[PDB]
């Protein structure tokens, strides 16, 4: 299957340069083009740049043409984006993207996205605390439990339960301290409380933090 | 530079309504117009290409129309899982241009929240901080008033809320309110309560616990 895997995100200070990469597999870049597309926090998709399979037809959005360079290394099956003079407006999730149409049908591929945060603030990993199920979080034969992922920077964190059930992940909120917090909450059967161990797995790539936390019932 | 203008910017309607989004191109683009669906925290997904052709697996309630400069996307019968942001996109040439996006939201009957409360963990208390979490589950509309009362002393300024996206199955929301005190304040007091008012609730609901 075609797969596109982006790399290079995290926090980066303004004025610096950053190179993102996208490792492609499942096809040879010998036809059509590849694109970068970005999306700033809760704003819309913005096409950023394209390059053709032969290295030609490089084009850029007006907002970035003066500072960005797209390139490709076919012997590595890798697409690059070099962003220079980084500034607040460049904070965004960056996607690599491939799209074309032929007689077999449409072909449309996106990476998972990598989040670039332009800031002078320092990286900080989260504390992870249990939201314990109890009488106070039960209705019917179902109980809510969760994990509080407190005080980290920059975004994102990922949360999974029992290494990948009504999971509600509450969007991260910027606190007055300048740091983010988020919660992930799941619903489980009450009958399971005290028998099954529930564990949230939290990953914060910008700080290389990976934490597992048992969430145990309270009385 | 081709400009793509979609309208409306946000679209709130009821399940079963026919809804239409327009896209206008500042140049002739023939039918080289695609429509993408994006849900929060996901990559976009192609739905319609060459103005009116559907991707395989796209439900038949979706359709697209138009040519040259005026285009539309119609959902003939809006369904809960259609809540998303929809983008038109021109692909006449090497690059791409997206419209600004249309956020489609669902209006539904009032659903009162279920209310849960979580005490601080002992691990957090070891750090000198005490976060107390109040959870409102699966309610509509999004508007809810949450009040923190500590020994019946109404709290202000020291809590923060986060609301989920609209649920893809039943169009409800959930919300968390986190009250953060110092360890010294938390151990000073006995009763922690969040009181909730919402359209679905005839009288306000209060969940409470006694510290220890």
């Amino acid at each position: 299957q075609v797969q596109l895997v982006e790399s290079g995100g995290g926090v980066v200070q303004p004025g610096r340069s950053l190179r993102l990469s996208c490792a492609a597999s499942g096809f040879t870049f010998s036809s059509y083009g590849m694109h970068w597309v970005r999306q700033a926090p809760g704003k819309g998709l913005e096409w950023v740049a394209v390059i053709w399979y032969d290295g030609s037809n490089r084009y850029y959005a007006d907002s970035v043409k003066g500072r960005f360079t797209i390139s490709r290394d076919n012997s590595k099956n890798t697409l690059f984006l070099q962003m220079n003079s980084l500034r607040a407006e460049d904070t965004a999730v960056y996607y690599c993207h491939r799209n074309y149409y032929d007689s077999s049908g449409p072909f449309d591929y996106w990476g998972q996205g990598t989040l670039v945060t332009v800031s002078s603030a320092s990286t900080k990993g989260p504390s992870v605390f249990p939201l314990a199920p109890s009488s106070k979080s039960t209705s019917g034969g179902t109980a809510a439990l969760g994990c509080l992922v407190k005080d980290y920077f920059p975004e994102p964190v990922t949360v999974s339960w029992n290494s990948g059930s009504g999971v509600h992940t509450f969007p991260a909120v910027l606190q007055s301290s300048g740091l983010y917090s988020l919660s992930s909450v799941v619903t489980v059967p009450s009958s399971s409380l005290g028998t099954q161990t529930y564990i949230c797995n939290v990953n914060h790539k910008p700080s290389n933090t990976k934490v597992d936390k048992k969430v145990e019932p309270k009385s | 530079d081709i400009q793509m203008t979609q309208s409306p910017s946000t679209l709130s309607a009821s399940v079963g309504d026919r809804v239409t989004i327009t896209c206008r191109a500042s140049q002739f683009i023939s039918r080289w117009l695609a429509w993408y669906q994006q849900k929060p925290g996901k990559a976009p997904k192609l739905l319609i290409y060459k103005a009116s052709s559907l991707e395989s697996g796209v439900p038949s309630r979706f359709s697209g129309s138009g040519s040259e400069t005026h285009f539309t996307l119609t959902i003939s019968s809006l369904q809960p899982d259609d809540v998303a942001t929809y983008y038109c996109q021109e692909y006449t040439s090497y690059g791409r241009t997206f419209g600004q996006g249309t956020k489609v939201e669902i209006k539904r009957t009032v659903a009162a929240p279920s209310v849960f409360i979580f005490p601080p963990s002992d691990e957090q208390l070891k750090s000198g901080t005490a976060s107390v979490v109040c959870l409102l589950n699966n309610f509509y509309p999004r508007e809810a008033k949450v009040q923190w009362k500590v020994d019946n002393a109404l709290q202000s300024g020291n809590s923060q809320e986060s609301v989920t996206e609209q649920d893809s199955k039943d169009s409800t929301y959930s919300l968390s309110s986190t009250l953060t005190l110092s360890k010294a304040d938390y151990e000073k007091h006995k009763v922690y309560a969040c009181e909730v008012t919402h359209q679905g609730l005839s009288s306000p609901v209060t969940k409470s616990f006694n510290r220890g």
């Binding site: 059509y32 083009g33 053709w52 037809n57 799209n99 074309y100 149409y101 032929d102 007689s103 | 080289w32 692909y91 006449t92 040439s93 090497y94």
Partner: peptide, 6 residues
């Protein structure tokens, strides 16, 4: 004519 099609 369209470089993304066929």
């Amino acid at each position: 004519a369209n470089p993304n099609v066929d």
